[PDB]
Amino acid sequence: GKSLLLKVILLGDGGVGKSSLMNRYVTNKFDSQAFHTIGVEFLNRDLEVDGRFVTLQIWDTAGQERFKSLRTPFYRGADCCLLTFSVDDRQSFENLGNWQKEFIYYADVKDPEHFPFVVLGNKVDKEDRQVTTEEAQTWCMENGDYPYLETSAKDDTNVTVAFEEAVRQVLAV
Numbered sequence: 001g002k003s004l005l006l007k008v009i010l011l012g013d014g015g016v017g018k019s020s021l022m023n024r025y026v027t028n029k030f031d032s033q034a035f036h037t038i039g040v041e042f043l044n045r046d047l048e049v050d051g052r053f054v055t056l057q058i059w060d061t062a063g064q065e066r067f068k069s070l071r072t073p074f075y076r077g078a079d080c081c082l083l084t085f086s087v088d089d090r091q092s093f094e095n096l097g098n099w100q101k102e103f104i105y106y107a108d109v110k111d112p113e114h115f116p117f118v119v120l121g122n123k124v125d126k127e128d129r130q131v132t133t134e135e136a137q138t139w140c141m142e143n144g145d146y147p148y149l150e151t152s153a154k155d156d157t158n159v160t161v162a163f164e165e166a167v168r169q170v171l172a173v
């Protein structure tokens with residue numbers, strides 16, 4: 001019959017790698033000189049998870065605060081939220097709780113305690129990390145027991161796994 005259509009939405013500070021993550025996963029391409037997203041964009045991607053056929057509709061958003069008004073209307077209907085930071089940007093990590101809360105409010109999330117969130121620490125390939133695997137993981141345990149993954153759009157480290165996990169989190173609810 002039909003594939004299961006699931007809507008996942010990437011949220012996180014400007015520069016973290018959201019569009020690079022979506023574009024690495026969808027078209028196996030990476031741009032070193034990626035330009036700020038100013039609105040929203042979605043790309044559909046087909047996969048099989050646990051021998052189950054899914055269409056993942058990945059919504060990309062502007063991470064910058066000036067474009068908040070453009071992205072917030074598109075949060076509603078998301079089946080999962082990928083809260084994204086960069087391992088070389090302590091502020092992006094510190095802003096996770098803010099992203100999480102902005103999602104729950106504008107997505108109109110009735111049951112936030114059970115809503116599927118996945119946290120991605122991107123840019124793991126880069127040498128000077130400013131945020132430790134341990135503190136990232138501890139935050140995720142303490143703030144809802146969210147699965148955490150370290151990713152690199154650049155090297156294609158854990159990108160497929162992150163998006164598969166988003167699907168698994170959805171199917172487990």
Ligand SMILES: Nc1nc2c(ncn2[C@@H]2O[C@H](COP(=O)(O)OP(=O)(O)NP(=O)(O)O)[C@@H](O)[C@H]2O)c(=O)[nH]1
Binds near residue numbers: 017035123125126155
């Ligand atoms: N080293 C490295 N650079 C990455 C990685 N992912 C993205 N980048 C780089 O980081 C910059 C920002 O990427 P981008 O995908 O545009 O980030 P964004 O979160 O979508 N930004 P915005 O919210 O403003 O649209 C680009 O120069 C891109 O090449 C990664 O895994 N590793």
Ligand SMILES: [Mg+2]
Binds near residue numbers: 019035037062063
């Ligand atoms: Mg972008």
